[PDB]
Design a protein around this ligand. Sequence first.
Ligand code: CLA
Ligand code: CLA
Ligand code: CLA
Ligand code: CLA
Ligand SMILES: CC1=C(/C=C/C(C)=C/C=C/C(C)=C/C=C/C=C(C)/C=C/C=C(C)/C=C/C2=C(C)CCCC2(C)C)C(C)(C)CCC1
Ligand SMILES: CC1=C(/C=C/C(C)=C/C=C/C(C)=C/C=C/C=C(C)/C=C/C=C(C)/C=C/C2=C(C)CCCC2(C)C)C(C)(C)CCC1
Ligand SMILES: CC1=C(/C=C/C(C)=C/C=C/C(C)=C/C=C/C=C(C)/C=C/C=C(C)/C=C/C2=C(C)CCCC2(C)C)C(C)(C)CCC1
Ligand SMILES: CC1=C(/C=C/C(C)=C/C=C/C(C)=C/C=C/C=C(C)/C=C/C=C(C)/C=C/C2=C(C)CCCC2(C)C)C(C)(C)CCC1
Ligand code: SF4
Ligand code: SF4
Ligand SMILES: [Ca+2]
Ligand SMILES: [Ca+2]
Lengths: 740, 38, 31, 80, 98, 144, 144
Amino acid sequence: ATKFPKFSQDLASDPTTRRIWYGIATAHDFESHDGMTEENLYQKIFASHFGHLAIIFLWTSGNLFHVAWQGNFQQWVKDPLNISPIAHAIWDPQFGQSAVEAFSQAGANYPVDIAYSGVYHWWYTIGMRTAGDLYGGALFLMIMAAVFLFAGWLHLQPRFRPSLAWFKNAESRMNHHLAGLFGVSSLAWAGHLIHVAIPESRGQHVGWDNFLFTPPHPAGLTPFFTGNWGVYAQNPDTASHVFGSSTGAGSAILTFLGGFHPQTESLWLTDMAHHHLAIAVLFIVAGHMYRTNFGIGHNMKEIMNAHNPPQGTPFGGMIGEGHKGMYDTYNNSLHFQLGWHLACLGVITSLVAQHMYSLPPYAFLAKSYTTQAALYTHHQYIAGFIMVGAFAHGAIFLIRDYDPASNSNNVLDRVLQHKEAIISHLSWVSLFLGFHTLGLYVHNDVMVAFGTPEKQILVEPVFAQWIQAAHGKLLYGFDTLLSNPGSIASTAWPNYGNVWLSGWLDAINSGDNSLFLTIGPGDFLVHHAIALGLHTTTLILVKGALDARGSKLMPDKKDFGYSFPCDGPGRGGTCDISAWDAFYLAVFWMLNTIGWVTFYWHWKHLAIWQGNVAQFNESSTYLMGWLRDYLWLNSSQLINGYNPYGMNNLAVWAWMFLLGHLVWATGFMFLISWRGYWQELIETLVWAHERTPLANLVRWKDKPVALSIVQARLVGLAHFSVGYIITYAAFLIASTSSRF
Amino acid sequence: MDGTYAASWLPWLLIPVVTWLMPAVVMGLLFFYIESDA
Amino acid sequence: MTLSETQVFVALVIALVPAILAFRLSTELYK
Amino acid sequence: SHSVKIYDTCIGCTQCVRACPLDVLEMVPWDGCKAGSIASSPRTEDCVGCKRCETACPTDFLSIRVYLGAETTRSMGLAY
Amino acid sequence: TLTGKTPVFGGSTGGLLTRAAVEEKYAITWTSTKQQVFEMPTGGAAIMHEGENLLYLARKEQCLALGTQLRSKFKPKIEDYKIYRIYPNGETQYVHPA
Amino acid sequence: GHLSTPISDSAFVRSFIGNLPAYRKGMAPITRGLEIGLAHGYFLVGPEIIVGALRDYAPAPYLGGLVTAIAIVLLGTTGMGAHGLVSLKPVAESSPKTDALMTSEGWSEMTAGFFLGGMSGAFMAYFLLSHFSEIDAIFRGFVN
Amino acid sequence: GHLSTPISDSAFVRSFIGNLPAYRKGMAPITRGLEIGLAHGYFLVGPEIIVGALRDYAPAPYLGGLVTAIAIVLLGTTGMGAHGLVSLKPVAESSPKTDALMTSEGWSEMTAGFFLGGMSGAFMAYFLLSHFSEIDAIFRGFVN
Ligand code: CLA
Ligand code: CLA
Ligand code: CLA
Ligand code: CLA
Ligand SMILES: CC1=C(/C=C/C(C)=C/C=C/C(C)=C/C=C/C=C(C)/C=C/C=C(C)/C=C/C2=C(C)CCCC2(C)C)C(C)(C)CCC1
Ligand SMILES: CC1=C(/C=C/C(C)=C/C=C/C(C)=C/C=C/C=C(C)/C=C/C=C(C)/C=C/C2=C(C)CCCC2(C)C)C(C)(C)CCC1
Ligand SMILES: CC1=C(/C=C/C(C)=C/C=C/C(C)=C/C=C/C=C(C)/C=C/C=C(C)/C=C/C2=C(C)CCCC2(C)C)C(C)(C)CCC1
Ligand SMILES: CC1=C(/C=C/C(C)=C/C=C/C(C)=C/C=C/C=C(C)/C=C/C=C(C)/C=C/C2=C(C)CCCC2(C)C)C(C)(C)CCC1
Ligand code: SF4
Ligand code: SF4
Ligand SMILES: [Ca+2]
Ligand SMILES: [Ca+2]
């Protein structure tokens, strides 16, 4: 046996190179380790979360420090429409001299990268103006990270090590995280916007020196206690206000306007202050709901036990009974919690993407096209990876932590009993969408190729156009609520508190933002392709989770774990039968789905930004238009980043574009060629080394073997995924930033 | 390679330290950790 | 305007205390 | 090594013993079936994990199950 | 500790490696009534002798694959093969038929 | 066993390979590493001289080949040294008659020899190429 | 006996000090001295470069730091060598299992390693500082 891995005696006695690979791959699976008690597990997770928090704070600190040290943040706030932001400086000694001049851009005389993360637009909106502002922010996140690093070390010391009951007190954790972590932080952020960001948005420098002596409002906290809070909703920043100056500046600190600031095309800062104060009240009072040792409140256990029928419908009845034992199903299983907390975070991460492009919260973000393209694609691919991992840990829970004795005829026991009905109904929706979305695309392709583009089938999306009309859009002419000026929903009859409505209908009928874009027949087909990708990826993940304990091909599948190669070539052959293998197949379908999502977002926005929205409306109904007018047409400036006549600043994206094609294709080797070919090949290399003089003096410590069956599915998926991401990221940024 | 930012001699040293010296030291130390017997 | 040479050198000194504390948390999580 | 488990549903047909290329398995008198013999796995430290025994087993489900465990030089099939 | 003639074979590249010297070895002995031709488990044709034979192989699976060839591919069949595990100190453990 | 080939039954091949400094009987390990190092550092300068980045750099056309060979000898020495630290046992914890390269002190003696030969063979090749116009005047008799 | 302190009961301190080349198990004494010498001769050039008498001498601004480090390594080698000659006994006149740095041949092996590492670490630091304008063009890409 060897030292590594310390946590697995079965792996440390492995004499081959598989021990090194599997020791890396199982290092954070803390439950599989030797001698892992349940509360040593929770304490190691707790300190690991302190380390992950400190990495985030050091990552943010490095973003602030490099923009303050090497960026152009002070020159950018004077003109945020034509200055490009600088991410950091380039130090690459392998550059030639014409690459130094090609990357000396954004008004800098040293090679720089143009930032596309949006940190300039975010730090400008929240009140930062100088490099000294970001530098004190950078120093503060470094001592904050040192605090969390020390706190993780301290809570592993034997005195300060928390007990198992401290980790499972869910009511005290929810009360402290709703009121404190959610509410007080949102309340403190409303405090930052009102005291700092809104004054800095009105030409007024407010820092740590003079924020105790400049009130946020001229009638300061004397009308807050008297209850006449409407004086905090004054004349707002006017329609001629210039952001960052006192020209046209109002004095209100808490408005209810809606729509966008007319210069920045961004949300009002006084609406974002009134947003964060209002939900702080809803979160602080929600943190006073569950009982702790102060005497009243709610046990979460007794609420779920009483919510069986419920019912005002009844519906007695058929479902289920259910919800008995689902407190301890939630509370004993960390894999149930992680699978549940990823499914919530994955919906929220994708909600961030769909709302930050249509309701931009940052000044001049809606005119920085490459940043808006990069931010949407970033948060949709991250939401796709988080969503697949929610189903992965749901399947790990069903193998490792699921108890059919405790969960006996509850809601979770019952979904497994009709599991052939859920999977077969997902299978029909996937087959119905795919047969008819692809059939409609191929039919339109044959019509355009035969020279008859009026025979192609163009179904208008009349249900989603009606929702746009129902939210106040006048382009389709439906004239229901919120586009009817005399409807019950628009007038808001008994209270007339519809203060947002004038700002909302001004912004939704402006034909210049990304707020409820005009959709046509090209938008119909691609939503049904997205629905195909959402349903098929769910089908692979659900069938992986619901067959994780067993099927007819392998009834004892929970005895073999989450991840195993196969069950041999018997019974017909059982390649990729584990629940890990259905994770592996679904990452392919996830990447294809987010591929279809971000292709459509990018092409529709690139058509709008180029002043030719008709090119999307004509070419997106057949698949040659996607290949020619989106993939082929926008590749032109990217692949000319270097050529035999020279290079420009897109040469790094051109080189990364080809690198991504290479990594993606290298993954195909691990996915197509399988193990026993490579093990027999390595056997001749082991022979050649032992028989070669002067080289057989050098002996390996670990016996060289081929990668395992599971490992190369993972290694092949990792090359496929990395090559997928950086190919599109190089193409998205270079096709958008070349013309904008 | 040059810079007009403050202390532009720092990437001159740190990029060889971060990308040559540190990986050779870390791969050296990880080689001792994963190949030490018993 | 960007940082001064003193501000960069202060940040490198300040970076040493999460560097020491991450090293302490590293060896504590290992054992 | 790997874990080879023989269950009580074995019919003593000895086809798994004939199928094993590493001579892991042998028949033990059992009187718990009509044949009176059951499969056993004494030399599991020589088992490679090929699952040729499970392919030969004619009961539904299998009376013999192989559980791939910790890898040794023998179980990885290495001649080096 | 084990007698028998080595089969007539020119050698090959598929035979014993460093593991046979430092970790474990295997030998198969069998008695034959004819000087005939058999296939090596490591590739190639060899000549077995009349009387006792002795062949050193790297793995137990290679010895048992040769014994399967000694059973099913010759007239008459050769059942009497014995397989021994040889350790580097010289300890020779009879492992088949157990 | 092995194959009987006209390369394996060649007496010149066995006398050449067997008397290379890795195998030559009676050598000390410091001398094995020194002879191996001097040969290896000397040729390692050459490639970056002819086709490297400083081949058309007039202030120092030979500096790129020297620091390339130095850093390769550094990583070669460190890899060879780390190899012996994890693979071998010292002379105390081994039996007598134990083939000194199979002990950790003998391997680390060979590692120290490879470093000293490698860098100085690299500096020797660098020094002759840097003084090549004066070596050429020596070899042509322009010094009379 | 000794004190139980959080420095003495520190496992990182004992693994760092115990694997410095003076203490690292399985090293040959020539390799201990070589690694110690290369580290020490390299830094010893530095002080006379920056604040020495030749710091403002245009014909050779780096020669003063080299010959300073050479003469310190000379007196360091001679003092270390004379130390072992008066303090230790040879491998013949000692017992078996005798910790090779406690014998005179092992100490003088370490002395020979310190000389060779020390002068060549000093020449290495001198060579990089003398070619610093060409190292700087390498590190900035003025060689393209
Ligand atoms: C808060 C989020 C979270 C947390 C705490 C966990 C935690 C865990 N997961 Mg889960 N999971 C998550 C999200 C999370 N996951 C997500 C988002 C996915 C979808 C990708 C999954 C899918 C998943 C599967 C299928 C499995 C786990 C497993 C695990 C457990 C062991 C992890 C391990 O040891 O491997 C350490 C991880 C690695 C060694 C992989 C690192 C390399 C990856 C592929 C990234 C490579 C990128 C590369 C370096 C980039 C360079 C590019 C450049 C060179 C060009 C651990 C409990 C395992 C488990 O529980 O077993 C029963 C398991 O089988 N997870
Ligand atoms: C791999 C993970 C990942 C990465 C690298 C990013 C990267 C980014 N995100 Mg995204 N995001 C992600 C996943 C990720 N995201 C997920 C999973 C979600 C859903 C939760 C989001 C939701 C999200 C939103 C809504 C936004 C971003 C934004 C950004 C960008 C700004 C940089 C930043 O976040 O600073 C680091 C940020 C912090 C460290 C925030 C600290 C402040 C916290 C929330 C509260 C602090 C409270 C305080 C301490 C309490 C004191 C109280 C006391 C005084 C009383 C950057 C591109 C922003 C953007 O688009 O910019 C243009 C943006 O608005 N992200
Ligand atoms: C472009 C490549 C491609 C295509 C077309 C498909 C198509 C499909 N996949 Mg697959 N998949 C792919 C790549 C692809 N996949 C890759 C690379 C992986 C990773 C290995 C997967 C992994 C995967 C999993 C894990 C699953 C699927 C499933 C499916 C089916 C989804 C249901 C549906 O939409 O029905 C519509 C049918 C189609 C779109 C295909 C039919 C094409 C036309 C209509 C055929 C016309 C007949 C033709 C002209 C006759 C031949 C001519 C002559 C030679 C006779 C569908 C057949 C799922 C499934 O099968 O559930 C039921 C499923 O669970 N796929
Ligand atoms: C954590 C985020 C982060 C990232 C991604 C970067 C990235 C970079 N830095 Mg910066 N650096 C950071 C934080 C970061 N830095 C902070 C907070 C400071 C202030 C102390 C610096 C001070 C600094 C200087 C002085 C220089 C760089 C330079 C660079 C560039 C070259 C690499 C290098 O030499 O770094 C050098 C690294 C340091 C000096 C220490 C970094 C300290 C961070 C916080 C450590 C982060 C560890 C991380 C959390 C571990 C994550 C886990 C891992 C598995 C991924 C590269 C773009 C060079 C450059 O700008 O070239 C043009 C350069 O000269 N950085
Ligand atoms: C003294 C002095 C100075 C300084 C210097 C130096 C020395 C500095 C540097 C600094 C540095 C160089 C820094 C560093 C930093 C780092 C860091 C800060 C890190 C972090 C890390 C982390 C955080 C980790 C994480 C992790 C992992 C990865 C795994 C495991 C777990 C954990 C979580 C732990 C100067 C010149 C200025 C001035 C004068 C004096
Ligand atoms: C539009 C609108 C609305 C509505 C909304 C709604 C109603 C929504 C909902 C939402 C939803 C409806 C969502 C959902 C989601 C879900 C998900 C995302 C799922 C996931 C799942 C998972 C992942 C699972 C897993 C698992 C398994 C598989 C097994 C066992 C374990 C567990 C459970 C973990 C309103 C009225 C407000 C108004 C405004 C507008
Ligand atoms: C005799 C001789 C020689 C040889 C030498 C040798 C013997 C070497 C060795 C070498 C070596 C001995 C090397 C080593 C390497 C290592 C490496 C390359 C490492 C890597 C690592 C890594 C990459 C890591 C990974 C990881 C882990 C493990 C955990 C987690 C984290 C990470 C992922 C980071 C020469 C050629 C000089 C010349 C002539 C003479
Ligand atoms: C390990 C080592 C080392 C160390 C070394 C040593 C060990 C040294 C030693 C040293 C020595 C060992 C020294 C010696 C010295 C001596 C002296 C300094 C002497 C003096 C003398 C005198 C002064 C004399 C006097 C007199 C007499 C006696 C008589 C009468 C006359 C008269 C008065 C003249 C070093 C640092 C390098 C580095 C690292 C490593
Ligand atoms: S385990 Fe299967 S193959 Fe073996 S004796 Fe029993 S029934 Fe026959
Ligand atoms: S898995 Fe293979 S080696 Fe093991 S008992 Fe079954 S047939 Fe024999
Ligand atoms: Ca050049
Ligand atoms: Ca002077």
